[PDB]
């Protein structure tokens, strides 16, 4: 489906490409196969991201990466890519709003769930390769709000920083107040506890 | 990782150095040599600098800003505008012109910063190149007053004549390819 859409959206195929024209245009790779080149990259990138956030043609797992310095757009539909959900930031305002958490709060008898949040475009799944192209905010309220200017172009925001830890390290209370090797040792000891 | 900046040198210490000494490895990971100066050279920093220059390997590639291989049929023609003056001066009383002049020219520009840092001399470099390749290379060097240090190299005039009636159609590397090989060898192994 992605290849069909790309053909619709003015992507010249490699076979039809005059060799001279490649130099000034971005190369579009899908699952590691160089499909073609696109003369105007940013419009295509925005359109692909819109499609993914509406879940129309591009599934949520599909990851689009644009390397601006190297003039390459890589789209990966491959399996085994590791992804984490992140909130989406437009302008400097989080897309998640009070109406969404009100619907989630009454998750029972409203049939509003994480899938609805993903479909609404509030959250998105981002793999590491796409993480390299994403400006993230650790905490929304602190970093998004205007201050002494550090970054005014945040594109995603972390849901909560404690989710970096795994299953065994999550049972540690006050992990940030421990030495790192001790957290590592508790992760091993917790597997051997009795219960 | 947890040595100090006081050493100001790469030093292998700890278990890897213990293994190097124990196994008596032919090639240490960081071979090093501590040189103690005899007399006034130890007292004066400038004399120590002289000794440093004597002890540190320096090649033409370190002091060469850029190299260009030109084709100039006539030395008097001076295809490069800049070298017109000194080529004319040298050919006012030309040397080795009687044998011939090789048309292919190797032009080497030497960075003044590196040249003065190692305290090398244009005449010194010319002598070293002349000794290394004998008479097969003819070198023309600018005066130090010139803003750009230029060294002009041509194939041997006798070799250009071939000094042989038969002349041998082998034509190994012609002259341009031979000049490129000469440039690579000079840059890598000049040992100025």
């Amino acid at each position: 489906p992605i290849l069909e859409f790309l053909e619709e959206w003015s992507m010249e195929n490699l076979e039809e490409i005059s060799p001279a024209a490649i130099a000034d245009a971005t190369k579009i790779f899908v699952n590691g196969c160089w499909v073609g080149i696109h003369k105007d990259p940013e419009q295509l990138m925005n359109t692909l991201r819109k499609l993914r956030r509406q879940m129309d043609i591009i599934v949520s797992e599909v990851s689009m990466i644009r390397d601006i310095r190297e003039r390459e757009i890589r789209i990966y539909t491959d399996a085994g890519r590791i992804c984490r959900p992140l909130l989406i930031v437009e302008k400097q305002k989080l897309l998640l709003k009070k109406r969404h958490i009100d619907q989630l709060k009454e998750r029972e008898y409203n049939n509003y769930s994480w899938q609805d949040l993903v479909a609404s475009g509030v959250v998105e799944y981002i793999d590491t390769l796409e993480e390299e192209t994403v400006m993230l905010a650790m905490t929304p309220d602190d970093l998004q709000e205007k201050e002494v200017a550090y970054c005014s172009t945040y594109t995603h925001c972390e849901i909560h920083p404690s989710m970096i830890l795994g299953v065994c390290a999550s049972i540690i209370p006050f992990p940030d107040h421990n030495q790192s090797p001790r957290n590592t040792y508790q992760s091993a000891m917790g597997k051997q506890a009795m219960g | 990782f947890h040595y100090a900046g006081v050493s100001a040198k790469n030093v292998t210490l700890g278990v890897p150095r213990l293994k190097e000494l124990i196994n008596i490895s032919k090639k240490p990971k960081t071979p090093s040599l501590t040189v103690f100066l005899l007399g006034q050279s130890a007292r004066d920093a400038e004399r120590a600098k002289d000794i440093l220059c004597r002890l540190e390997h320096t090649t033409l590639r370190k002091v060469t800003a850029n190299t260009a291989i030109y084709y100039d049929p006539n030395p008097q023609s001076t295809v490069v505008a800049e070298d017109q003056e000194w080529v004319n001066v040298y050919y006012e009383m030309p040397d080795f012109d009687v044998a011939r002049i090789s048309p292919w020219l190797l032009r080497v520009e030497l960075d003044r910063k590196h040249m003065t840092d190692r305290k090398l001399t244009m005449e010194q470099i010319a002598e070293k190149i002349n000794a290394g390749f004998g008479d097969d290379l003819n070198c023309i060097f600018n005066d130090d007053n010139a803003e750009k240090l230029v060294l002009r190299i041509r194939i041997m005039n006798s070799d250009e004549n071939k000094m042989q009636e038969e002349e041998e159609v082998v034509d190994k590397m012609d002259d341009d390819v031979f000049l490129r090989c000469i440039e690579s060898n000079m840059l890598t192994d000049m040992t100025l």
Binding site: Q179, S180 | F1, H2, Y3, A4, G5
Partner: peptide
């Protein structure tokens, strides 16, 4: 975890 000269 301390510094460059100390320990990690």
């Amino acid at each position: 975890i301390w510094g460059i000269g100390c320990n990690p």
